[PDB]
């Protein structure tokens, strides 16, 4: 990121964390992980529960 | 036709209503995301020879009755009209994502497209799975979760418009049914 | 209905002539996907004529049906 | 010889149908006749399974006799053919609201989503599949019989306000319950009612005990909705084949 | 009791109507057929036990399952139970040779046995090859007459059809 | 039709009482003994095709002038109404085991089958028998004691709806009787 | 008398099959659910004495022209009455909650309710104000549960909108 | 495609009534039993082509007949033929499983079948001889949970009283 | 007609296809919404008498054409006739949002009402605006912000639910447009 500012937003993949997006990606395309993506967004700002 | 802005103009006329800031607001987040919606109108237009022979070889490939004789897409004169017939069904649910509204595709293809394939004797089980794998290649293009060609863009959610566009592709899947 | 009809009489005309020749941008019937000429031609130069698609006709494309009518016709 | 060309108005039948504009409101013409004398054959073909029951091993049952003297059964037809005519002379009041009366009773019936998709589409083949059920099962009011005299007055209670259905809301008559329309029409009607009524009494053993059982299910899963007109509907069956349904005003 | 008389009759009766020059034209052919099928009806009658214990070994010479424990023929007091109906149906065709037309057949011996046969178990093919084996067991100069092996093995074909 | 819960309410009409405290701990055990009901009437429909097959000839069995020649089960069409008619009478017992009431057996079935029977002559008294046999047949099922099928069920003791659907088991047969 | 239980069955007489897990499905929720409207139905056992009161003068409350002679409520004995009706719609209410569905009311209460009414030239105006008393006296956690309140002001809604 | 909501809608439907608390109820059991038929029908949908395979060499070594000339399977193509069909009835197993309800068994693979394989000449023990070998095969406590077996054990005995 | 969980199994027929765990966690999500599903159908139905009572009378102030002498809403059996038909429009959306799809909204109402209204003689345009003042009643009355009632709910957030009941009442417009 100091010598490539363009690869944000660019997964870096199995050596980084896991990251999240609601996505949503179906042939009627509806999120299924609004359950997930709410505990995971309670632990990206509290870091717990 | 109409796009997304003049179905609330249309809505507010029936109410002799100026429209105001209580409703610009869902007005002025159609143009903040409005980006997003050219950077994935680009994604289909960009594959869409590659979407029309992936769909309708995945037809004949899931029904094999169609290319035995007497078939609908038997000979070579009949394999081409439908070859053309997927790329005007995709061409105007491009229209009609681009318009943010589905009144293009109401008025200009899916008029008495029904009342054409019942004289044609076209078999309307097969023309759903046309339709329904070119659904599933367009979620997949705009989402980027595409296996065989992988694009680039900027970081963001953009899965309001693969379902936005997975619901222009039930209409005609509910018009010709 | 009223002036602005026809006049059926299949037969018509009358004469056992040879017959003359037609254009090349028909209808088909065989191939109707097909571009056929007007791919590389002067119709590339000129406006795209007007074919009526929509049912409702609106206010801004009915004058700009009639300035064809006035040209062309 | 004369130079006779094949015409403007013959030569458009081998058209081939295109998508919008006009030349969609033809195809749209074309197929709307090619699915009504469809629904005629959907509704033909169920009626000709209905009267295979009244032809049960190959010989013609008492249920299926036209009239019993010499042109008894010529006037059967001459007056099922201007029954039909004064069927499409009422207003659009009575034409949907029939079709919707008839799309009601229509999906009760169905066993399967494939028929209740067919009823829907269909409205010939709905009509005559509310009469072809009742005609099989005997559940009919040509075919019920009382056995009591208070079982006689509950089934002339139910047929007193169906008789005023076939009257007009002011209160004069429709031209749905008609019987005569010549001279003596009306009394070679009479003749064939009366004689209809005979053979009811003539059936079998189980076919007087099997027609009790089928007039309490129809009037139980068509025309009960609450517990009282179940027992209304259990216990009296001959007032529970009275009820038909408000298509036809009777 | 489909026969020629029943069916002439009782579609005169449906229109209310005596019985015409086409009603009496049909049974002239009651009296040119007869022949044949009496003649078949008494070789039937004298020759039964000979015929259904011909017939029902062989279905259990070509299905011998049904000999296995917990199958259809498993004891001794229901195999013999298997020949009481073949010895049924040919009862039935005997009966139907002699009115000359499908009737005891149809309302006695087959308007209810896929109700019956499904519900006990019972395989329709076992029924369908003791038919099909007296069908061609028969030749025409030696066990009857050759019009009335024409009826016979007819009455036999309705009975294989209504099974299968 | 009425079930357990109306019942007690019907009962209670007469006297113009509302239904409180003295009659309601009788409904609450019937709810909360109400997972054993379902597994109950499961069992019994379960095995409702070969309770019919094991009833209907086993009353032959036991009473063999029933197919000779004059007898009430010697045609196709005969035995066949008697196998439609085994499956009537088992059906309306699950109807008013699953609803804890026999009103939708004695109002729906029962009324009128003894005026019905003595007018088409079927025995009543090996129509008994078919039913004395069915009876048998499901209180091992419910109490899974029957000697060629186990059912896999939770540890317990339901005596009670063995019990009642015996007690369903005789007002068909003292209708007939 | 359409409950829960008796919908189910008498949908499955009319196809004429057996309860299948579509139907034992449904008597599951009146386990769950059942906790409720019966723990609702002991607090209009113990309360109906007060809560008929306190509705019958809501209706004089708002209506104060009934007592007047030339209209209607001038004496004694058409005023006791309207108590009368109004402890049997509650009465109706707490059978409805007893048998899980709407059947009491319906048969009882609601049935033929529109033609008594008129023709005894009776105001049904009156009679929903009385109704509707009762469903904003009720506050939820101090007398009955939460889940109890939804039940017994389902009821009464739903006489609401059957009377107007 | 009777379920617990298509029962409740058409029964209201029919009574043109608004849904009342008698119809949510019913949606309520469709709510708590919906746990144990989903782990039902996710074990299927990941087992099968190994269910399939054993039920169908547990027709073809009990009922050794059939692979006679003559018979239903005779070559191979007859044969793929039989486990296309046991793989038919195991996907509308799990159809089942997941509506909650026999209604993609009622309308797919029940109705029409008894007129088909009786033409076809099918054996309908047979199929019912692979159905019952998968009920039987199924312990419980290893493949799935106490009440997932309760409902995956009662779509296949409705398979087998209505095939037989 | 159809519902969510019958509707996700007639598109695995169409590919023959097991329906396993990629999407059964989308039909896990409508049970977890069922609660709340089942807690604002509730909603509607006890406040339909008067949500066709403050639609057609708000048609007539708004269009005071359709007291005119000769109207469509003139006489008082016409009258009765369009209150009528207010509850049944109200009672199909009803039955699409307890089922979770618009297939009984569909085919058993729609499905022919356009050429019902052409046949009759019904103005149409009045039709789309007593149909728009439903919408607005159903999803202040699901999302709790009516004004002159309020009902208790457990606190949450129901968006989803008021957006998808507004799906259904222009899908009426729709059809008879
Ligand atoms: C048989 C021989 C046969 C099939 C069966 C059928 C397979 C099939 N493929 C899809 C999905 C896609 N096709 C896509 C198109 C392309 N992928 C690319 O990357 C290039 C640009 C282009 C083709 C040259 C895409 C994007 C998809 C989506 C899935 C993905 O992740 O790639 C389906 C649809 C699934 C469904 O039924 O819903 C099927 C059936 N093709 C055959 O030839
Ligand atoms: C059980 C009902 C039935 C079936 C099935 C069938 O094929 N025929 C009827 C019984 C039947 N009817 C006749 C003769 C006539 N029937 C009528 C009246 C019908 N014909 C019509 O066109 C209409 C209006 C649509 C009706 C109701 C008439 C006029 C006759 C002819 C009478 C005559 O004297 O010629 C017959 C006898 C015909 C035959 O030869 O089989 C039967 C068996
Ligand atoms: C069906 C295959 C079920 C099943 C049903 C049960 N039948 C039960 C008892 C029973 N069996 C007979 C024997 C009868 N069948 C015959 O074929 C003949 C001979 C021709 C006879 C006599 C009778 C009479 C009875 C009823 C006893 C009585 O009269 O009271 C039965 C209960 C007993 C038990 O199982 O131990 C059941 C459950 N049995 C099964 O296991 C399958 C699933
Ligand atoms: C292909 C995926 C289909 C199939 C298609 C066939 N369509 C044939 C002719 C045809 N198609 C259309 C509709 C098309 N034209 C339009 O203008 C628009 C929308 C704006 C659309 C969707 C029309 C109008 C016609 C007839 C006139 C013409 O051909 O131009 C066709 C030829 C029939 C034959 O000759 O055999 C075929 C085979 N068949 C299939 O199996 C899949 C489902
Ligand atoms: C009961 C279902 C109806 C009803 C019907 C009417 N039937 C009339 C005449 C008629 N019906 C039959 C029976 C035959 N027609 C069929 O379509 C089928 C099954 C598909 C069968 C078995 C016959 C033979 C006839 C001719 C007259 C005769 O029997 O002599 C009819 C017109 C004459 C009449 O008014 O009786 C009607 C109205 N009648 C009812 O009351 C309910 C509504
Ligand atoms: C031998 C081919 C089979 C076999 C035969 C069995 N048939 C059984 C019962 C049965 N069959 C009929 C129809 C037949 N009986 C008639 O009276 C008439 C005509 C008037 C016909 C065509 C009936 C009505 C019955 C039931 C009564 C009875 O026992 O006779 C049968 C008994 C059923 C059972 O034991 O479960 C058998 C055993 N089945 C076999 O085991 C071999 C393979
Ligand atoms: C005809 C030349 C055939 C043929 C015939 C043979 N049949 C033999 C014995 C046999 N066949 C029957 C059935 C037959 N007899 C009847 O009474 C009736 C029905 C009324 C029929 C269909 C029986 C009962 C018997 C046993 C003694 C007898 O009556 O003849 C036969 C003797 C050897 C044997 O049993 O196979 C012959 C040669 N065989 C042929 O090759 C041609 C085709
Ligand atoms: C079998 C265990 C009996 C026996 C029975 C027969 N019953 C016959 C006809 C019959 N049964 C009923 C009653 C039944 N139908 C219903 O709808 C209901 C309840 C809702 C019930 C209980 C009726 C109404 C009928 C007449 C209708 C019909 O034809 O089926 C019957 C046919 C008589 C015949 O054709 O000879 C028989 C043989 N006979 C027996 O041996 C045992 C004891
Ligand atoms: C295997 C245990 C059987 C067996 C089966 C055979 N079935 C044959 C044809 C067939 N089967 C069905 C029913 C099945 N197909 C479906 O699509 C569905 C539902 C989705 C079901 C339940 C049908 C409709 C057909 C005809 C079409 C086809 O061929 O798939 C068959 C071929 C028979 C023939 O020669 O025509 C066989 C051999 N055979 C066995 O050995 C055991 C009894
Ligand atoms: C008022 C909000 C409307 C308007 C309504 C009118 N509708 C009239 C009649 C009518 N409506 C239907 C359709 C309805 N019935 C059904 O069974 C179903 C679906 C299950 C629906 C949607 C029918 C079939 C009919 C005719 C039969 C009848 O009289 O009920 C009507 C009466 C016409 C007249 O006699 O004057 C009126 C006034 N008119 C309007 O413009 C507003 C928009
Ligand atoms: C003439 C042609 C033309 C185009 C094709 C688009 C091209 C385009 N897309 C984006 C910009 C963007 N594009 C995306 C899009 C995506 N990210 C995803 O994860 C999805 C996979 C995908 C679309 C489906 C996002 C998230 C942004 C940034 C957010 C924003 O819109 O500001 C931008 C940057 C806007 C900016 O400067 O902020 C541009 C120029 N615009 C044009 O003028
Ligand atoms: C809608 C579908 C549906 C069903 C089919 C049943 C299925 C079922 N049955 C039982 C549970 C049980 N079932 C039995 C019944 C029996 N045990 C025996 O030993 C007897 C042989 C047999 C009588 C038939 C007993 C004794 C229990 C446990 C105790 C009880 O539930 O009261 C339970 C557990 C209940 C609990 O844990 O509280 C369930 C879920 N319930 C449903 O919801
Ligand atoms: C000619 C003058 C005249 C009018 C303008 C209308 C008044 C009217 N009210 C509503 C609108 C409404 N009407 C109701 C209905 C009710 N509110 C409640 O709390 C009660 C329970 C129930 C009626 C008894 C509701 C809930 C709204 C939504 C707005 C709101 O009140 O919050 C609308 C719809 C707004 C739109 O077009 O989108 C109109 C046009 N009636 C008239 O007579
Ligand atoms: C027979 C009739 C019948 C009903 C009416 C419902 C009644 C009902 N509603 C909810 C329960 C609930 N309901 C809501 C719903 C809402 N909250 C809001 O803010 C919105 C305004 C509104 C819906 C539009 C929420 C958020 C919950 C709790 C979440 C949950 O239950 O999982 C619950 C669960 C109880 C709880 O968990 O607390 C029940 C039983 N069920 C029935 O059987």
């Given at each position: 990121q100091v010598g490539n500012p363009s690869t944000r937003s660019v997964s870096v993949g199995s050596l980084g964390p896991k990251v999240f997006k609601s996505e949503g990606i179906n042939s009627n395309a509806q999120k299924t992980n609004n359950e997930s993506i709410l505990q995971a967004s309670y632990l990206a700002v509290f870091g717990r529960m | 036709m109409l796009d997304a802005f003049s179905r609330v103009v249309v809505n507010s006329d029936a109410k002799a209503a100026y429209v105001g800031g209580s409703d610009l607001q869902a007005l002025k987040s159609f143009i903040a995301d409005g980006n997003k919606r050219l950077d994935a109108v680009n994604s289909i237009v960009s594959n869409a020879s590659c979407m029309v022979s992936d769909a309708v070889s995945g037809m004949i490939c899931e029904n094999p009755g169609l290319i035995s004789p007497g078939g609908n897409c038997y000979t070579n004169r009949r394999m081409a009209a439908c070859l053309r017939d997927g790329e005007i069904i995709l061409r105007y649910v491009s229209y009609a994502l681009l318009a943010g509204d589905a009144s293009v595709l109401e008025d200009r293809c899916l008029n008495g497209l029904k009342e054409t394939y019942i004289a044609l004797g076209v078999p309307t089980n097969s023309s759903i799975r046309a339709v329904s794998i070119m659904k599933a290649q367009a979620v997949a293009f705009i989402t980027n979760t595409a296996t065989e060609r992988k694009m680039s863009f900027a970081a963001g959610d953009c899965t309001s418009l693969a379902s936005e566009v997975a619901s222009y592709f039930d209409r005609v899947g509910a018009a010709i049914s | 209905l009223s002036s602005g009809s026809s006049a059926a009489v299949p037969f018509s005309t009358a004469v056992r002539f040879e017959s003359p020749s037609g254009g090349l941008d028909r209808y088909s019937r065989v191939d109707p996907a097909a571009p056929g000429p007007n791919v590389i031609t002067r119709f590339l130069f000129k406006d795209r004529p007007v074919r009526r698609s929509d049912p409702s006709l609106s206010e801004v494309d009915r004058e700009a049906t009639m300035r064809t009518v006035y040209r062309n016709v | 010889?004369?130079?006779?060309?094949?015409?403007?108005?013959?030569?458009?039948?081998?058209?081939?149908?295109?998508?919008?504009?006009?030349?969609?409101?033809?195809?749209?013409?074309?197929?709307?006749?090619?699915?009504?004398?469809?629904?005629?054959?959907?509704?033909?073909?169920?009626?000709?399974?209905?009267?295979?029951?009244?032809?049960?091993?190959?010989?013609?049952?008492?249920?299926?006799?036209?009239?019993?003297?010499?042109?008894?059964?010529?006037?059967?037809?001459?007056?099922?053919?201007?029954?039909?005519?004064?069927?499409?002379?009422?207003?659009?009041?009575?034409?949907?609201?029939?079709?919707?009366e008839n799309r009601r009773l229509a999906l009760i019936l169905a066993q399967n989503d494939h028929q209740e998709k067919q009823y829907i589409k269909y409205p010939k083949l709905a009509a005559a599949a509310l009469m072809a059920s009742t005609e099989v099962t005997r559940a009919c009011q040509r075919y019920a019989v009382p056995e009591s005299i208070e079982e006689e007055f509950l089934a002339a209670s139910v047929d007193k306000v169906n008789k005023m259905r076939g009257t007009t809301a002011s209160g004069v008559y429709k031209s749905s319950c008609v019987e005569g329309n010549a001279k003596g029409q009306?009394?070679?009607?009479?003749?064939?009612?009366?004689?209809?009524?005979?053979?009811?009494?003539?059936?079998?053993?189980?076919?007087?005990?099997?027609?009790?059982?089928?007039?309490?299910?129809?009037?139980?899963?068509?025309?009960?909705?609450?517990?009282?007109?179940?027992?209304?509907?259990?216990?009296?069956?001959?007032?529970?084949?009275?009820?038909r349904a408000s298509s036809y005003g009777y | 009791m489909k026969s020629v008389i029943t069916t002439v009759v009782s579609a005169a009766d449906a229109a209310g109507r005596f019985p015409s020059n086409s009603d009496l034209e049909s049974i002239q052919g009651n009296i040119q057929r007869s022949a044949a099928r009496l003649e078949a009806a008494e070789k039937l009658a004298g020759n039964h036990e000979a015929v259904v214990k011909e017939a029902g070994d062989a279905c259990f010479a070509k299905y011998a399952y049904l000999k296995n424990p917990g199958e259809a023929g498993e004891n001794q007091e229901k195999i013999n139970k298997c020949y009481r109906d073949v010895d049924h149906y040919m009862r039935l065709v005997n009966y139907c040779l002699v009115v000359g037309g499908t009737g005891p057949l149809d309302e006695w011996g087959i308007a209810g046995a896929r109700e019956v046969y499904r519900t006990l178990n019972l395989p329709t093919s076992a029924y369908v090859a003791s038919i099909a084996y007296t069908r061609d067991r028969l030749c025409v100069p030696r066990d009857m007459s050759a019009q009335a092996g024409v009826e016979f093995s007819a009455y036999l074909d309705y009975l294989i059809n209504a099974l299968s």
């Open positions: - | - | - | 010889v004369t130079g006779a060309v094949s015409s403007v108005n013959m030569r458009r039948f081998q058209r081939v149908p295109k998508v919008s504009g006009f030349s969609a409101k033809v195809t749209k013409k074309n197929v709307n006749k090619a699915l009504d004398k469809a629904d005629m054959f959907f509704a033909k073909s169920v009626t000709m399974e209905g009267k295979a029951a009244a032809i049960p091993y190959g010989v013609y049952g008492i249920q299926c006799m036209e009239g019993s003297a010499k042109g008894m059964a010529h006037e059967k037809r001459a007056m099922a053919l201007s029954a039909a005519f004064r069927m499409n002379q009422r207003s659009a009041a009575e034409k949907t609201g029939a079709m919707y009306a009394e070679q009607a009479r003749v064939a009612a009366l004689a209809v009524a005979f053979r009811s009494a003539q059936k079998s053993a189980s076919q007087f005990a099997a027609e009790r059982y089928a007039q309490s299910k129809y009037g139980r899963d068509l025309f009960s909705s609450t517990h009282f007109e179940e027992g209304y509907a259990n216990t009296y069956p001959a007032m529970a084949a009275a009820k | -």
